[PDB]
Amino acid sequence: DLNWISSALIKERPSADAVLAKAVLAAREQLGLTQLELAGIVGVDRSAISRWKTQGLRVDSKTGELALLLVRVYRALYALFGGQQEDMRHFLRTPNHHLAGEPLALMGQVQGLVHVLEYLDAIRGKV
Amino acid sequence: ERPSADAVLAKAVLAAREQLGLTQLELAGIVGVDRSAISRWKTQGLRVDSKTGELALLLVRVYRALYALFGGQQEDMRHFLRTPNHHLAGEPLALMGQVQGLVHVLEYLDAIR
Amino acid sequence: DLNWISSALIKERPSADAVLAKAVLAAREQLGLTQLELAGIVGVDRSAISRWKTQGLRVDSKTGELALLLVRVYRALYALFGGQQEDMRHFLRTPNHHLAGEPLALMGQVQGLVHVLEYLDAIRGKV
Amino acid sequence: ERPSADAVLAKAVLAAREQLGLTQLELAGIVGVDRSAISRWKTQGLRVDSKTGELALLLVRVYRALYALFGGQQEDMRHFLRTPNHHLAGEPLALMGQVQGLVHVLEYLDAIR
Amino acid sequence: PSEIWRQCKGERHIRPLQGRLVRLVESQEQVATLQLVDTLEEQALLEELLESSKPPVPADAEPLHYLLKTPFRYPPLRWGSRFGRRHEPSLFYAALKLETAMAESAYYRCVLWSGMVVPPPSGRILSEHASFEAGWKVERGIRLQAPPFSDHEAALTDIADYRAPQELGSAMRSAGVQAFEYRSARCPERGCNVALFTPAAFTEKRPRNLTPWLCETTAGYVAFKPAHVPGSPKIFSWELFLVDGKLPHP
Amino acid sequence: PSEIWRQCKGERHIRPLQGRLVRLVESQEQVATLQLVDTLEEQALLEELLESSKPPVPADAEPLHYLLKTPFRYPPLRWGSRFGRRHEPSLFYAALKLETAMAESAYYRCVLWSGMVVPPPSGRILSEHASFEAGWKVERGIRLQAPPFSDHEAALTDIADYRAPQELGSAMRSAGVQAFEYRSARCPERGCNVALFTPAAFTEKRPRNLTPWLCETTAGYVAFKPAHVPGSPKIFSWELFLVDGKLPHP
C-alpha cells in the first residue's frame, strides 16, 4: 500500500515522440554535429529540427528511423570508445580504411548510414 | 515532356511496384512517404536528392537483383518477397519496410546473384 | 609459441612513489583543491609538492599515508556520486549534518580526515 | 624560559611513551618521524601544528583512555596494547602503526569507557 | 544487557539457520582510480598502495572473495549500524530478496543526499551499482521476525532509534549467535534482512549472479535499472522513508 | 563449394559434443542512452524505440537471454566472419578459455583502432567490458582442430583471408552442423574457439559468471583488468597479431 501510492504520486509516463526528439538533439550535441549535418542525416530541414521541441519527432515516421539509427550510432560509439567524447567525434570525422570514407560523410546518405551502423554493431564483442 | 532526373526515377519506382505486386501502402512504408505522394510522382517526379529518392533507388535496385536472380520470372520474384526466408531474419517484403532491412535484403540478393 | 611477445616488452614496472605522486596530484585537480588546501591535508609545504613530480611521494612516510587516505576519499566520492565532478566538489565544500562540519575543512586535520573517509566508506554498499 | 605549546606537547607524548613501554622505533612508526628526531623533542619541542603533532596528540589521548579504563595499572595498559584483541582486528599497538588504526584504537577505548 | 534478549529467553531459540542473501553494492571504485593514472598497470599498483592503508581484514575473512570479505573490515557509521556499534566488529548486512536490498540501498542514497546542508547540484546523480547473491548457513541462528522476538518488532524496526537493536546485537554476539534474520525497517513490502556476525557463515566460495545496475538519485526518488539487459526502472520514492518531511537517522 | 569439407568427408565426422564457452562483450550501451535523456523511465522508453529499428531476432533465439540472443541478430563485418559471410545468418562466436576470449577481443580492439587512418587523439581508450560463461551441447558437432580437419589448419587459421574457412562454414551449415570448434588464429596459447549456428546449442537460457572488465586500448597494446576485484592487468601487445609491420585484415 505504501509502495503503491508512493509510486503513483511520482510515476512518469513520457511521450515517445518527445523522448526521441530530446535524444537525437542530445546525440547531435555530444557528437558535435551542426544543425545542417543532422538535417542531412535524417532528411529534414532546419525549420523542422527546431520544430521538434514543440511537437517531438514522430517515431513511426521514416525520419524517426533515421534518427533511431543515428542514436544507435552514438550508442555503439559510446560503448566502443568508453564514452570518450572527442574519440567518438574523431571516428566520425576521420577517413576510415574499413568504411568507404569519412563516416559522417557516409551517414549523410541512407546506404552509408546503415554501413556505418552495421560496422559499429559488428565490431562490438556483443555482436 | 523531355527527360529529367526526377521523372525517370519515378517510373522506375512505379514500374517496380507493378512488377513486384506491391500495394500502395507497402510501397509507402518502404520509401517513407504518404500514399498521396505516390500519385504525384507520375504528374511530376521523385526528387533524387532526397531520403525518399535514396530509399526508392535502393528498392529499385532490389527489383533489379530480383530480376537478375529470377531471370525476369515475375511470379518467383513476388513469391520470394512474401515467403518467410531461412537466411533472412524474416519475410523479405516485411524486412524492406524498415531501413536496415531494405539494405539487408539488397545485400543478400547481390551476394547470391 | 609467441606468448613471449606480450609476456615481455609491453609490461612496465612503475615506481610506487611516482604513481602515488601522480595520483594525488590528479585527485587534487579533479576535486578542485588548491595547492595550499592539498598542503594542509597531507601536511607538507607547497615547495615539497613541487618535488613530487621529479622525486615522487615516498609511500613509507606518514605524508604518503595521508595522501593514500585522501585518494581513498576521492575514490569513495567518485563511486558514490557516479564520477559527477560538480557533485563530488560540492560534497567537500558544503556543510554536512552527519559530519562535524564541511568535509574539506575537517580533512585539514588528521582525525577529521579519518572521520570523512570512514563516513564515505561506511555509506557505500560494500561498507 | 616561557612555556610553549611545542614543549607542552613534547612533554606529554614523552610521558605517554614512558608509561606505555614504547620504544623509539615503535613511537617513530606511530607519529611518522625518525628515531633521531624523537630525541630532539626534549630540547626543542614537537610542533603542534604538524601532522606529527596531531598524531602525537592522538597517541596521548590513547594513553589517557588506557589510564582511565585500567585505573592506572601500568602493567595492564601494556598488556592491552601487545595482546591480540578479541573485538579488534589485531594487536592494538600494531593497529596504531597506521593512521586509521590509531584513530580506531582511540574510538574503541572511548566507547568501552 | 539487552532487555529483549533477557525477555524472549533468547538462548532457548538459537537454532541452525540457512538461506540465500542479496546485496547491492557500488562499482566504479576501480574506474575512479583509473582516472588518476595513465595505464592499467599504474592503476593496479595504486590499488595495492591504497589497500595497505585500509583497516585490516579479520583473519577469518581473509580467504573469502573480495565482495564477501570487505564488509567485515570497515567500521560502520559513527552512530553505529542497527545491530552493531562503532566499537564492535562490523556485521555483513544483506537482504533475503532483491526488492528489499534495493529499498535498503535507496534509503542510504537518501542518507548521503540529506547529509549535505545544500542538496547536490543539478538535482540528479547517475551512479552504477552491482548486486550479487550468496548462500549462508550457520549452526547457531536467530529469527528476529519469529513469534518470540516479533513481540519487540516495533523497537527492532524503529526508523531513527538504534539503542534497543544495538544492545540486542551485543547480547546475541556474546551468546554465540553466528547469524540472524530480522524485519527490514525500510522495505515497504516488509521484506526480511539477514546479518552475519562471522565470515564462516558463507557456504560458497564466490558470489553468484553478479548483476550491474544503473542508479538515478534525485531529491524525490531513487531508481534502479539493469545496466546490461533491457528492463524497466524500479522506483523508490523518498516518501517511503520520510517521517515529517525529514529523513530519519539515529 | 568447400572441397576441404570434401577431402575430409566431414559428414561422417558429425558427432555429438558438449562443452563450455566464455565470451567478452561490451557494456556501457545503456549508460550511453542515459546521457541522452533525463530519467531512467525515459531511457527505458528510448531503448524500446531503438529496439524497433534493430534487425529482428531469429524466432528460435527469442526465448534466450539478451546476451545469448543478440549475436544471432546482427550481420557480421562486411568482409564476413571467419566461417560466415555477410549474406548468411550470423554465428555465435566464443572461446573455450578466458585467455583466448581476451586475445580475440584484443585483436578486434586493434581492428577498430586500425580502421581510422589517423589514431584517436587521446592515444588511449578506456572502455568497460563484461565476460560471461555458458554451457553448450549439440547433437551435430565438428572439431576443425581434429587430425582429419587439422591437416588444413594453415588455411583455416590464416591471419588475413577468410575464403577457405567461409566456404567450409557454408558447407557445414548446409550439412546440418549445429556447432563446431576450431583453432583460434589470434590466441598466443593456441587456444580453441567454438561457433554456434543455432541458438538451440545452448544448454541453459541464462549466462553464467558475469564479470566486469576494464579495458585499455593504445596504439601499442590492449590490456584487460577485472573492474570489481583487485587484480593485475592481462596485457596483449599488438605484435601478437601484426604481420610484417601492420595488422592484417581480409
Residue numbers in the entry:
A (entry chain D), C (entry chain A): -4 to 122
B (entry chain E), D (entry chain B): 7 to 119
E (entry chain C), F (entry chain F): 1 to 250
Give the exact sentences the study uses for this entry.
Here, we show that the NatR–NatT TA system, which is part of the core genome of the human pathogen Pseudomonas aeruginosa, generates drug-tolerant persisters by specifically depleting nicotinamide dinucleotides. We show that NatT is an NAD phosphorylase, which leads to the depletion of both NAD and NADP in a subpopulation of cells. NatT function is tightly controlled by NatR, which is both an anti-toxin and an auxiliary factor required for toxin stability. NatT belongs to a subgroup of RES domain proteins that have adopted a Flap region mediating its interaction with the anti-toxin NatR.
To elucidate the molecular details of NatT activity and its control by NatR, we solved the crystal structure of the NatR–NatT complex. NatR–NatT adopts a hexameric structure with two central NatT molecules flanked by two dimers of NatR (NatR’ and NatR”). NatT is composed of a peripheral ring of α-helices and two central β-sheets that form a cavity. Although NatT is structurally similar to other RES domain proteins it harbors an additional helix–loop–helix domain (hereafter referred to as ‘Flap’), which provides most of the interaction surface between NatT and NatR’ (C and EV3B–D). The Flap contains several conserved negative charges (E26, D38, E42, and E47), which form electrostatic interactions with positive residues in helices α1, α4, and α7 of NatR’. For example, E29 of NatT forms an electrostatic interaction with R119, the last but two amino acids of the C-terminal helix α7 of NatR’. Moreover, a well-defined tetrahedral atomic density modeled as a phosphate molecule was found in the interface between the Flap and NatR’, in close vicinity of residue E29 (E and EV3B). Residues R82, Y108, Y162, and R186 coordinate a second phosphate molecule in the active site of NatT, positioned next to the nicotinamide group of NAD+, that likely participates directly in the cleavage of NAD+. In the NatR–NatT complex, the C-terminal helix α7 of NatR’ extends all the way into the substrate-binding cavity of NatT, indicating that NatR’ controls toxin activity by blocking substrate access and that dynamic repositioning of α7 and NatR’ is likely required to activate NatT. Of note, the Flap is tightly sandwiched between NatR’ and the adjacent NatT protomer, restricting Flap movement and keeping the active site pocket occluded by the C-terminus of NatR’.
